[PDB]
Design a binder for this molecule. Sequence first.
Ligand code: CLA
Lengths: 222, 211, 742, 42
Amino acid sequence: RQLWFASKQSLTYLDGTLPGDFGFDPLGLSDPEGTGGFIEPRWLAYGEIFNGRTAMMGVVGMIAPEALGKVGLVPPETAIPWFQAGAIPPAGTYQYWADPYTLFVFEMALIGFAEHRRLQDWYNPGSMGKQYFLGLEKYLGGSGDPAYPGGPIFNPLGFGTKSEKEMKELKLKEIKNGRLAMLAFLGMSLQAIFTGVGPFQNLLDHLSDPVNNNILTSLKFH
Amino acid sequence: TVCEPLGPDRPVWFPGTAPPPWLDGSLPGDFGFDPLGFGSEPESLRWFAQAELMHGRWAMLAVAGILIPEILQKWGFMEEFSWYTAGEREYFADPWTLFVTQMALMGWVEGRRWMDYLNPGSVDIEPRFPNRKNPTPDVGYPGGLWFDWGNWGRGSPEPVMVLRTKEIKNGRLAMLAFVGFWFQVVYTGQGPLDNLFAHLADPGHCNIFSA
Amino acid sequence: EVKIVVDRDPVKTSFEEWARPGHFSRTLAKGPDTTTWIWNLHADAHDFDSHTGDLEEISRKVFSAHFGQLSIIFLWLSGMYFHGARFSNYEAWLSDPTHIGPSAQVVWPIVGQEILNGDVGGGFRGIQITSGFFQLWRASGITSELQLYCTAIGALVFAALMLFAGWFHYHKAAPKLAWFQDVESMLNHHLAGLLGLGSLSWAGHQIHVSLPINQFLDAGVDPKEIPLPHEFILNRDLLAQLYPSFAEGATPFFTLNWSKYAEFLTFRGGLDPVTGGLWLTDIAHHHLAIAILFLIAGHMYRTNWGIGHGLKDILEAHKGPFTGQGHKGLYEILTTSWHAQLSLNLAMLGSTTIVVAHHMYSMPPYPYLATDYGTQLSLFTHHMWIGGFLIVGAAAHAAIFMVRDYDPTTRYNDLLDRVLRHRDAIISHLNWVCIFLGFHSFGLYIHNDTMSALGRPQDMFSDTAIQLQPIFAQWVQNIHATAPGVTAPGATTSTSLTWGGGELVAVGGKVALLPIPLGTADFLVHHIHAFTIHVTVLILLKGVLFARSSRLIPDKANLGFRFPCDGPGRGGTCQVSAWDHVFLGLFWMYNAISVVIFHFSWKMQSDVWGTISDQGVVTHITGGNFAQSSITINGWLRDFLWAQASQVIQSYGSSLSAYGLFFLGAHFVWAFSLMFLFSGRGYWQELIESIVWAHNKLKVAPATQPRALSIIQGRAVGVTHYLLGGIATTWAFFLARIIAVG
Amino acid sequence: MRDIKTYLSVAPVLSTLWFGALAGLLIEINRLFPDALSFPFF
Ligand code: CLA
């Protein structure tokens, strides 16, 4: 428990239940005097896991296309900053294999399917392996805890061989990489809101010229 | 009469949820979907079941009458134009005469049916030659060789509840289809096949969000 | 310390009770043996504190009730914005607001009321409005019906959301005590969070949307091709074209050389001749400075951390020699009795509403507001009425607290104890002051009227006769007109224009504001106001101080808050409950507000409002006869009350004809009130008895045994009808007169 | 359910709907017979 900016209302409930408790919570949210719905410590660990994972995937993906465009062979047809890809209309757009809006509602419906089923599992664990699902039924029981589902659909290669220690390592790795990807995503987006040129080009910049130091300018522009 | 209580025999409309206890699943087409609990008491339950069956059958007839003539116009010989504008089509007689005749005859019929609902078996049409015992009723399924001359609603071709399930499901779907057709004509100015083909040509853009 | 503790699902959302009325009251739930049951049912619905004995449940109930109230308010706002969108001429009004009457309500052509949709100009027909929304919608740069439409939609969404939140917080997740009773964090937030950030975000919406579009409209452009708001923030070059400084991003702010932004944040003062309104730069600077002030204020009290004060640690220190122990323990009183808080907040809210009413007219914030006469007048008088009602409610609930939840054994105090220990002195001296003011402020009018009707004008009270001069007011006005010279260099003119120095602001041949002089009539009217206010205070303070026990009835409190009397004994004991004290004070508050609003109307229409000639000669709407005809009651009849009641009485067969009709019904109810206020009960009981006989003779006697209203309900219905009649009369009078002439 | 029925049978809501229907009938008659002063049928 490497104490970085802790408090006592943190230690009221942060007693070391989350894998690798570092003790950093000044505010003391999940005090268990009255358990707030969705403020449950279980729900908090669940949320940090899910958010960090999504942030890992996002920091890989948003940066992938243009970056690869640099000295790679993904065409310049998509050499566009993630914040200019089209998600931000005041930045850019693109002609796709559908129209914008219906595409968005369609992907929303799909992600909704997935996350609704996951939440229903959260309420009643294991309870997805009962109803007809056109197959897939004998897999979605999970590994008990909705935090960690397991299953050969989500455990292909096979790790944590005969172990909980290996799972503890792999998993610390999980929390650390999630937090790092969170930081990197937030930084890319803040540069984008204040710089206006794109992350990978910002690396192109900060490889040679040290004098950049654009906190000195603090120039706020689109 | 077969029951569909909880368990694997009960595929819940909302996975991972216990259906409302007063939703047993006897009525074919049941999946435990009544968050508003309108079926709380049994008399309301049967009343709503009758309403659902009637709506489903009438919606099937309506959607058939919309669909078939429009496609037989598009490609077939006779050209039945916009059905939504067929309501004001000009015939031999005025619309009010048609209305009053419809109301008279349908009042007669639906009133006999209403009395049958209120008093089962007391208003039925099933002749009886000697020594051949007639069938009973299950209101909503009159039976006898007036509305079941194919002998489908009784046994042999399929266990009953399965066929009634087919009927109620197709009826819900047809209700959706009718309200969709009407709402489209409110928004767009073509028939269902026209919207269909327009969507086929340009699936990516030719949609509601096309404007 | 302080946490998020709540409880789960006390009461289930089951309709089991809706079919059983009066489930809350044990007696009410039994059944209506008579007809008074259905009065008593409504009469005690919201009476939460008489339904339990613990503060947790009533606190939960009021938490849900606040959500109900907010849902109603949001629905009202949504209706307003909708009717502005789909049924107004708002675009035509924006085209040129000088001589186009704001109309936002049409009537269906069914029963001859087509005449209601009178001529309002701009190719429109509709009932003219005076709510004054249009000045706001032009301040916020709405300038498009799509905006009103989507705003109404969003308001409906928020209304449904609040209703949900209500249902959920009462039924599913009920808050607990240590949450409610925790006022430190509530103050902390509401200071820093709600008000401050509110004004800050509004300053945002003003500097980034309103200011440019308003400046463009003042330059003069059809709002069709006026650039959309978001196209003023996305592409910077527009604002760059407007304000050079504004094209410098954020360096001049962070680097502490704020003077660069001087263009759009300034301290000009005065009004803007292009629209008579306020310089939106000024109001933006105001809202922003206020935001910063509330934010820095919000950080007072210790909540969870080690810094900050405690509302218990502040009172007990103060303890003077005369009073003794000071405010010790008062923190517990104002945390253990809702009615106390309701009274305090209602008093402060009424006072704030009154001061808003005042500050409105003298400093028109909105643009093209000080030239739509009826709007200004109606707004002012409405705010005045709301303030009066809030104050009376404050006094009533203070009395209720004094009766029920006050007790020295555990909710002790040494300050209120002293206050009550010498109540007689307070009431006596206030009474004598009331007599003195009554005499020397009304007998003056009587003397003046008499010495007028006796052909002795040179013995009158006026400027042309024995003279009374309001010297202190003119002194203050001189100071306010010479203050921007030395004391407040950063300003440009006086804080407003009503101060006795400067020029006049006139737009579209009509004047909006100019200096205001005070004559002896103003002295007299001010003393009338002071007297009437003192008498209302006397009534209500006597009620509160004597709600516990009087020297007439020794144990009044035991008899409860609201009871009719204590029998005709000891020479008669009618109207001794504090409830009846409030019943009395209501009429006097009505009278105070009525005379105040009459004075305001006459003074404005006789010294400020009116038209300006091409050369610059002013001819006020009424001719400026105040300082010579406000000093005789007979004058008030002749010059103001009779004369300016023309436009309402000839109003038949015109657009304004509705304002005519009410002018009678308003009076009628007004009559009707007397029937309840004067009579008693036993007479009506015997009459009802004979009627029950007449019916029973025909086998029609209803089981819901008829009963003449109880005494307290009789007084209540009487006072309600009377207030309704009076306020509706003055309402019809005002609207008809001002909207016809002006 | 039956609870909401008995609640709906409480005089306020029943009276409101009855009066609304009656007023609608009257205003519709007035629409279809403007100003309707006399009895010009017999
Ligand atoms: C059986 C259901 C069904 C189907 C197959 C369609 C199909 C279609 N509709 Mg449609 N619609 C429906 C119900 C349906 N609708 C309902 C209930 C309404 C009332 C709200 C509408 C209102 C409507 C309008 C206003 C318009 C269309 C249009 C269209 C066409 C283009 C697609 C589009 O943009 O609309 C997408 C349709 C919707 C978003 C409606 C949502 C409601 C349905 C039920 C969605 C649920 C999906 C369904 C349950 C799952 C599939 C069931 C089965 C088909 C396998 C397309 C042929 C457009 C048109 O005329 O084509 C050019 C058009 O402008 N629809």
